[PDB]
Structures are given as structure tokens and as C-alpha cells.
Amino acid sequence: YAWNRKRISNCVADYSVLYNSASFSTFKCYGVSPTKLNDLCFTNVYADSFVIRGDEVRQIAPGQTGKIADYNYKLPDDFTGCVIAWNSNNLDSKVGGNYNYLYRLFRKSNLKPFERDISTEIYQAGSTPCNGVEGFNCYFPLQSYGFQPTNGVGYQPYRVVVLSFELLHAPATVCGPKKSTNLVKNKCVNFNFNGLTGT
């Protein structure tokens, strides 16, 4: 419900390690083939990180419905970044149960894409104003995830990271490790001139 966000800027980005780490249950990319994205220049990158169940990992995708994609973290239908998710059952749990991660279950209206709401105000499951205090048919809209090492696959914690690039006009700051040779002038060449490949 409070999915964290970080800005990636002014660096060389080696996606070969992430793609060939082979320890990822899900690595799917929208708007760019995963293999070729390494050889491409992005203006800015936003890496957004959080944790979810199993059955909800399918739900991190544009045009998806349900609790995560309607009340917690909504992906725009015109997405350009791409989704990484791997099992972290052994790290995020403990015997007896882990109750640190929350998730939102009751919201009046769906989330616009990339909108984060961290309020703690009571939900109106009933009709009478319960006045910001818990009462009959006024539940709490942050239900807790519970994680024990013994749970089934469907309830294990998947650590998820959304790598939302923006492929666009702006001066690229994050892209792959080319040699970046010197130019030639007045004789027509075929350049990969900052990703604007052409002759």
C-alpha cells in the first residue's frame, strides 16, 4: 500500500545480469523485448519495489482488475517499463507468522495509474458516520499480510520490482555499456547515435 519508489539516473545500466540471473520466477517486459532493452537509451528510470502474494503477481500488469490493481498499485494501460518478481519465502517470513507488510482492502474508488495513498482513515462499510473511529460496519482498510514458512505456494511472499522506464525524446541518462566510438563526418555512415539508429 506504500510501495516504495526510487529514481535511477546518470549511470550505466547492465540488464544482462538481471536477465540471466535465472533466479526470477517472473520477468516480463511491456513495450520492449527483454533481450534488446540492454542496448537502448532511457531518459529516466523509476524502480518501484514492494511485496505481494502469489495469486496477485499476475495482477501487476496493465488493464488488470482486483485488489492490488484497484486499491493498492495500479499500472497504466499504456505501460512502458516492465515487471520483475521472485520468490522470497525464506527472507520475508518467520516461524509463527510475519505481520509487518499491510495491504489495502477497502477503498471507495479505484486508483488512477501510479497513485499511492497512505491514509489510515476508517472505511464506511456501513452507512452511519462512525466518525473516524472503529465501530459496527466500519473496518480498517489496511489488512495485514501474514507470513509463516509453512504456507503454500499461493501465499508465499514474492518480492516485486517495477522498472518503469520512459522511452522518450529527453536526453537519456541511463543506458547500456557501449564503447561509444568517435564520429566520422562528411561521409555517410550508419550510426546508433544515442539509440537513433540510422544512416
Epitope: E134, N137, C138, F140
Partner: antibody, heavy 102, light 105 residues
Framework: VQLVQSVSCKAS????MNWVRQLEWMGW????????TYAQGFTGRFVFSLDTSVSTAYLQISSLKAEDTAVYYC???????????????????WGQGTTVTV | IQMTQSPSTLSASVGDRVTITCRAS??????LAWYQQKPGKAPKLLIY???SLESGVPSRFSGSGSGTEFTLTISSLQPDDFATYYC?????????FGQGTKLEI
């Protein structure tokens, strides 16, 4: 709103959870967080280790004693499942009750 | 805290009004509930807040009083209501029960 008594009470976390015996009070396990405080004589002697995704409030009776023979009820309070405020919301519905013999 | 109900065991005819009073060791301040348990089943709600009836409970059970002292009344005694009845408290942290009342026919 049916409570299944089998030791663990399978629910059936909109509301919290509560436990009692026969008639005293076991000490109000919270389901939305880690286990908070208990009854006066029921803190260290009786533990719950609730497990979710089936929402069963586990019981482990520590240092099992001769006169523990009793009928244990899991009871679902009226409302209020939140974190670290200690409602005055005791009991709404009940189940069949597990019969322990010692 | 401790709950003292004046009735302990009482019986009468069907169609009768029964009165039960329950007090506590100090000012409980309308934080009280009234329960009844039929034999061989876990107890059930009849009054919360010491003054409001439950979902689907018959209207003949009315709770009145204030401060420390509260009272349940049955307008038309029913033989199914033959059962034990318990007055518990909400103000003090330990929700304790009492010696209860028995109602027969």
C-alpha cells in the same frame, strides 16, 4: 459467520478474534498484528500463535496442568480489527467449543 | 472487577415477566452486555451497551439501568428461554462473567 471448532478455530479478518473457556477470558488475540496483551493470569501460561490464509487462532497451553479440563470457545468480537489501541469490543458470535480432558 | 447478579435460579409459568439485576464492584458506566446460554451450546448475545437489542433477538428482553446497576426483563417467558444468563462488563479491561441466573418452567 460460522466458527469451526476442531486446537485451532478456523474462521468462517474483517473483525478481530477473542478466546474464552468454561467461564473466564483467554485474552483477546489480535488478528491484524502480532499478539498483544492478555488476561491477568493468562499471559505466560497460555499462548496463541495464530496462522492466517485459513485464519485459525492456534492454542498452545504451556505447562499443561491437572485441572485444565474445560470447554474452550473461540469468539468473534463485534468489530474493530486494527492495531495497538485496545478496543472495548468483546464478543459477537461463537462456535461449538473444543473439549479438553486432563 | 466482579459481577454480582441478584437472581441465581428462578422458575415460573409461560407468559410471565422475569426480572434480573446485575451489579459490579464499582461504577461500570453503561459498559455491559447480557448473555444467555442454553444447555449444550456456546452462549449468545441478547443485549449490548446494556440498552440495545441484538440482531434477531426477540423484543421481550429489555435492558434498563445505569451507573453500576443494570436489569434485564422478559415480558413473555418462553420455555425455550430455560437457560443460564450472564451479565458481563466492558469498562474494565478483564471481561469477566458472573454466577449467572437459571430460568426454568
Amino acid at each position: 459467520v460460522q466458527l469451526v471448532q476442531s486446537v485451532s478455530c478456523k474462521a468462517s479478518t474483517s473483525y478481530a478474534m477473542n478466546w474464552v473457556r468454561q467461564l473466564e477470558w483467554m485474552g483477546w488475540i489480535n488478528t491484524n498484528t502480532g499478539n498483544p496483551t492478555y488476561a491477568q493470569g493468562f499471559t505466560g501460561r497460555f499462548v496463541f500463535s495464530l496462522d492466517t490464509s485459513v485464519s485459525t487462532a492456534y492454542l498452545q497451553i504451556s505447562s499443561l496442568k491437572a485441572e485444565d479440563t474445560a470447554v474452550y470457545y473461540c469468539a468473534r468480537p463485534q468489530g474493530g480489527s486494527s492495531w495497538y489501541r485496545d478496543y472495548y469490543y468483546g464478543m459477537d458470535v461463537w462456535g461449538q467449543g473444543t473439549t479438553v480432558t486432563v | 472487577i466482579q459481577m454480582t447478579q441478584s437472581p441465581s435460579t428462578l422458575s415460573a409459568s409461560v407468559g410471565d415477566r422475569v426480572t434480573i439485576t446485575c451489579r459490579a464492584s464499582q461504577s461500570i458506566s453503561s459498559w455491559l452486555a447480557w448473555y444467555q446460554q442454553k444447555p449444550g451450546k456456546a452462549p449468545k448475545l441478547l443485549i449490548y451497551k446494556a440498552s440495545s437489542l441484538e440482531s434477531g433477538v426477540p423484543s421481550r428482553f429489555s435492558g434498563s439501568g445505569s451507573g453500576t446497576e443494570f436489569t434485564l426483563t422478559i415480558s413473555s417467558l418462553q420455555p425455550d428461554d430455560f437457560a443460564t444468563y450472564y451479565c458481563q462488563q466492558y469498562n474494565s479491561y478483564p471481561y469477566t462473567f458472573g454466577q449467572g441466573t437459571k430460568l426454568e418452567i
